[PDB]
Design an enzyme around this catalytic site. Structure first.
Site, PDB file in Angstrom:
ATOM      1  N   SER A  62      29.738  65.247 -19.323  1.00 19.41           N
ATOM      2  CA  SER A  62      31.062  64.942 -18.827  1.00 19.41           C
ATOM      3  C   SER A  62      31.499  63.481 -19.092  1.00 19.41           C
ATOM      4  CB  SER A  62      31.111  65.245 -17.296  1.00 19.41           C
ATOM      5  OG  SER A  62      30.907  66.609 -16.996  1.00 19.41           O
ATOM      6  N   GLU A 113      31.347  73.773 -23.267  1.00 17.61           N
ATOM      7  CA  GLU A 113      30.401  74.119 -24.328  1.00 17.61           C
ATOM      8  C   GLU A 113      29.652  72.866 -24.789  1.00 17.61           C
ATOM      9  OE1 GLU A 113      34.394  75.007 -23.500  1.00 17.61           O
ATOM     10  OE2 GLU A 113      32.992  76.675 -23.775  1.00 17.61           O
TER      11      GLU A 113
HETATM   12  C1  LIG Z   1      29.740  67.376 -16.749  1.00 17.23           C
HETATM   13  O1  LIG Z   1      28.650  66.852 -16.993  1.00 17.23           O
HETATM   14  C2  LIG Z   1      29.779  68.549 -15.802  1.00 17.23           C
HETATM   15  C3  LIG Z   1      30.225  68.234 -14.354  1.00 17.23           C
HETATM   16  N1  LIG Z   1      30.305  66.762 -14.121  1.00 17.23           N
HETATM   17  C4  LIG Z   1      29.291  66.338 -13.449  1.00 17.23           C
HETATM   18  C5  LIG Z   1      29.141  65.061 -13.118  1.00 17.23           C
HETATM   19  O2  LIG Z   1      28.149  64.565 -12.478  1.00 17.23           O
HETATM   20  O3  LIG Z   1      30.044  64.347 -13.535  1.00 17.23           O
HETATM   21  C6  LIG Z   1      28.307  67.477 -13.233  1.00 17.23           C
HETATM   22  S1  LIG Z   1      27.244  67.300 -11.773  1.00 17.23           S
HETATM   23  C7  LIG Z   1      28.166  67.688 -10.259  1.00 17.23           C
HETATM   24  C8  LIG Z   1      29.187  66.580  -9.933  1.00 17.23           C
HETATM   25  N2  LIG Z   1      29.235  66.552  -8.466  1.00 17.23           N
HETATM   26  C9  LIG Z   1      27.823  66.734  -8.049  1.00 17.23           C
HETATM   27  C10 LIG Z   1      26.994  65.441  -8.121  1.00 17.23           C
HETATM   28  N3  LIG Z   1      27.391  64.482  -7.084  1.00 17.23           N
HETATM   29  S2  LIG Z   1      26.629  64.556  -5.655  1.00 17.23           S
HETATM   30  N4  LIG Z   1      27.001  65.968  -4.974  1.00 17.23           N
HETATM   31  O4  LIG Z   1      27.156  63.530  -4.818  1.00 17.23           O
HETATM   32  O5  LIG Z   1      25.242  64.598  -5.973  1.00 17.23           O
HETATM   33  C11 LIG Z   1      27.307  67.847  -8.991  1.00 17.23           C
HETATM   34  C12 LIG Z   1      29.233  68.701 -13.279  1.00 17.23           C
HETATM   35  C13 LIG Z   1      28.407  69.928 -13.640  1.00 17.23           C
HETATM   36  C14 LIG Z   1      30.362  69.837 -16.379  1.00 17.23           C
HETATM   37  C15 LIG Z   1      30.363  69.832 -17.857  1.00 17.23           C
HETATM   38  O6  LIG Z   1      29.478  70.947 -15.994  1.00 17.23           O
END
Ligand SMILES: *C(=O)[C@@H]([C@@H]1N=C(C(=O)O)[C@@H](S[C@@H]2CN[C@H](CNS(N)(=O)=O)C2)[C@@H]1C)[C@@H](C)O
EC number: 3.5.2.6
Length: 267
Positions: free
Chosen positions: A46, A145
């Site tokens: 991301s 993807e």
């Molecule tokens: C991109 O990688 C994905 C999407 N973006 C994420 C990210 O960390 O930017 C993941 S992880 C997800 C984000 N919020 C949580 C982590 N923060 S926390 N709860 O405070 O630990 C989980 C997320 C999958 C996309 C491509 O899948």
């Protein structure tokens, strides 16, 4: 010497969790840098959403888009992990809210919509980065993807250095004027996903803005940040990690630690 000891520590750290760490840190006051594997390629996950929001604000600044124009997507099947766009499905969202959603909650729907309608897709995101003089950045696939993080595949990769340099040009540099730059910073400062990462490696009163990423495959995760310590010049940290096995989980604590070591190498 200050450099070689940080390199030792990072090397230990990457062996400890049985993967690979990429770091690049700049002190924008003094010019001092530190890198470790800072020219090797790492999956973006991301994290490129941070540049997407800046691409959008560049278009705003040149008046090719209005930050308050409504973007309607009433018919679309939202991508998994669109926590923000799902809630606004009926009403649409402003371009600016949508962009910052992309950045602040890593919303995949926000991401894909912007790239399809305003940005010329993956090729056009890569074009925006050449235009600021990032030559390593590549985007190939769409939001959901681009996460496969398969070792050796160069799709959807950049290098720690190149990311840092870009963020420095965008957050602190001269692609965005005063006004639009402050919007962009405030966006980074409000990111919600990075409490355990670079944010965790610095004192409580320092202001931080960042963008994270986690592929969910090959333990791949990353973070980059602009850091404003009290009464001192801003710092850029850029931390990318991957792990040996497909099924390994990311480690936030490793990122936070790699960040501490990096802030210390340029101090
Ligand atoms: C991109 O990688 C994905 C999407 N973006 C994420 C990210 O960390 O930017 C993941 S992880 C997800 C984000 N919020 C949580 C982590 N923060 S926390 N709860 O405070 O630990 C989980 C997320 C999958 C996309 C491509 O899948």
């Amino acid at each position: 010497n200050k450099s070689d000891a940080a390199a030792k520590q990072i090397k230990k750290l990457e062996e400890d969790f049985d993967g690979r760490i990429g770091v690049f840190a700049i002190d924008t006051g003094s010019g001092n840098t530190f890198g470790y594997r800072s020219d090797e390629r790492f999956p973006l996950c991301s994290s490129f959403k941070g540049f997407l929001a800046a691409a959008v604000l560049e278009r705003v600044q040149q008046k090719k888009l209005d930050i308050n124009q409504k973007v309607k997507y009433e018919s679309r099947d939202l991508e998994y992990h669109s926590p923000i766009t799902t809630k606004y499905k009926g009403s649409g969202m402003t371009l600016g809210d949508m962009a910052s959603a992309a950045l602040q909650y890593s919303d995949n729907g926000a991401t894909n919509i912007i790239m399809e309608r305003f940005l010329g897709g993956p090729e056009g995101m890569t074009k925006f980065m050449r235009s600021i003089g990032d030559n390593e950045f590549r985007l190939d696939r769409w939001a959901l993807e681009l996460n496969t993080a398969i070792p050796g595949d160069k799709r959807d990769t950049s290098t720690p250095k190149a990311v840092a340099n870009s963020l420095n040009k965008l957050a602190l540099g001269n692609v965005l004027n005063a006004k639009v730059k402050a919007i962009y910073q405030n966006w980074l400062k409000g990111n919600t996903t990075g409490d355990a990462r670079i944010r965790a490696s610095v004192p409580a009163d320092w202001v931080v803005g960042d963008k994270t990423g986690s592929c969910g495959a090959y333990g791949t995760a990353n973070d980059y940040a602009v850091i404003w310590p009290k009464n001192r010049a801003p710092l850029i940290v850029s931390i990318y990690t991957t792990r040996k096995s497909k099924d390994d989980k990311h480690s936030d604590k490793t990122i936070a630690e790699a960040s501490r070591i990096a802030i210390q190498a340029i101090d």
